Design a protein around this ligand. Structure first.
Ligand code: ZN
Lengths: 49, 397
């Protein structure tokens, strides 16, 4: 779904983990499912890095 | 300890859910757990046994992951997983037998074997799975100081005891008074007697009493009360107090008059029941106080009046008794009972491998000697060993 990461290099790192044939199943399945949390009131955001 | 239960939970589920022909979506989340067991366990090495006749074995883990690409599981996928499960289930047997056999006196709640101390690192914490059993749930609630509870069917709360008490005696032993009792398992049978049948008592009534203290506090018990002690009803000969001589007891049995059963907690009366037989409850208690009395019958037919004269030769002795029995109760410490076999698994390991007597437990794991002096140092060891015996019972019956 619509998920985001924290800047431009942590998207370039996690894309190469998704591609190569060595990473395990619980890590490759995970980075298609990690989520930010916006929470418009209280002004607190969360982004993976 | 928490990761030893988590190894056995997903080896039990791996033999049950990974069957031939099943759909892959039924086992899609177990294989992610079972592959993540293997990644954590590879490269490590272990050593179990060494005490008694328990042999020394070395363990080494180098396995490969399972496939995650079929739609229905076939016989290649089952037979390549059974020869991985059968090595882990042999490892867990020898860790559980290594821990049920050891004990300490300073802090018995800590792990004692070499393998279970090594599994308590933060490297192995990712193997942790759900904790849904009764003993592993009470292991975690009690570790944070929250209130726990074990449910028993006929709990072995009374140590074995069979004795008497003479409130009136002479060396001829022909005019006696007192009580007799048997406390064994979860059953109390007390019986009071009087040879004169209250011929000289004030208002022809003789009062009896029997007080049984417990070792641990029971909660929400279901108790059956019946107005006869069937064990102290026949003629018998009994030795004296110091084993010198023997004395004879020939009973006839009246009904118990004015029965009062009280359920105490720190000397406070929680419950009471007055001439009420059958099934009763007891919400919170640690001391049972039985009270009952003998009354001479004021009207007697000629067949009865010959039995109880006024003079000294009393050939038929009066007897009044009760019978109490705990069906099920909830305690907070571990005990033994009549339904589950956790005490039998602990003693059978120690007897098989010829284990020497240690500093804590009685010789031969005698339950009468263990509930008699049930110290807090023995309670922490007994919970640590019944919990390991509960983990081993999932894999190996
Ligand atoms: Zn039963």
């Amino acid at each position: 779904d619509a998920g985001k990461v924290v800047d431009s290099e942590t998207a370039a790192i996690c894309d190469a983990i998704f591609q190569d044939e060595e990473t395990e199943g619980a890590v490759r399945r995970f980075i298609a499912e990690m989520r930010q949390r916006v929470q418009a009131d209280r002004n607190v955001v969360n982004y993976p890095s | 300890m928490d990761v030893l239960y988590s190894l056995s939970k997903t080896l039990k589920d791996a033999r049950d859910k990974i069957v031939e022909g099943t759909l892959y979506s039924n086992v899609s989340d177990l294989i992610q757990q079972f592959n993540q067991m293997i990644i954590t366990m590879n490269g490590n090495e272990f050593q179990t046994g060494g005490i008694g006749n328990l042999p020394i074995r070395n363990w080494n883990f180098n396995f490969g992951l399972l496939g995650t690409t079929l739609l229905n599981l076939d016989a290649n996928y089952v037979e390549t997983a059974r020869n991985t499960i059968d090595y882990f289930v042999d490892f867990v047997d020898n860790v559980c037998m290594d821990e049920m056999v050891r004990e300490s006196q300073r802090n018995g709640i800590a792990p004692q074997s070499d393998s279970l101390r090594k599994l308590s690192a933060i490297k192995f914490k990712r193997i942790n799975f759900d904790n849904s059993s009764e003993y592993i749930e009470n292991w975690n609630l009690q570790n944070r100081r929250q209130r726990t509870g074990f449910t028993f069917h006929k709990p072995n709360i009374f140590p074995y005891s069979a004795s008497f008490t003479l409130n009136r005696s002479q060396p001829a032993h022909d005019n006696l008074m007192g009580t007799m009792w048997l406390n064994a398992g979860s059953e109390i049978q007390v019986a009071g007697f009087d040879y004169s049948c209250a011929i000289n008592a004030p208002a022809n009534i003789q009062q009896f009493e029997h007080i049984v203290p417990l070792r641990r506090v029971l909660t929400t018990a279901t108790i059956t009360l019946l107005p006869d002690a069937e064990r102290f009803s026949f003629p018998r000969v009994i030795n004296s107090a110091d084993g010198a001589t023997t004395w004879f007891f020939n009973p006839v049995i009246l009904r118990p008059n004015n029965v009062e059963v009280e359920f105490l907690l720190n000397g406070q009366i929680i419950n009471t029941y007055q001439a009420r037989f059958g099934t009763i409850v007891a919400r919170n208690f640690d001391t049972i106080r039985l009270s009952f009395q003998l009354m001479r019958p004021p009207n007697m037919t000629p067949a009865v009046a010959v039995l109880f004269p006024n003079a000294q030769p009393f050939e038929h002795h009066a007897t009044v008794g009760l019978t109490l029995r705990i069906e099920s109760a909830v305690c907070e410490s571990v005990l033994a009972d009549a339904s589950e076999t956790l005490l039998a698994n602990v003693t059978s390991v120690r007897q098989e491998y010829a284990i020497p007597v240690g500093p804590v437990f009685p010789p031969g794991m005698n339950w009468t000697d263990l509930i008699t002096n049930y110290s807090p140092s023995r309670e922490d060891n007994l919970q640590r060993v019944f919990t390991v015996a509960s983990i081993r019972s999932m894999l190996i019956k």
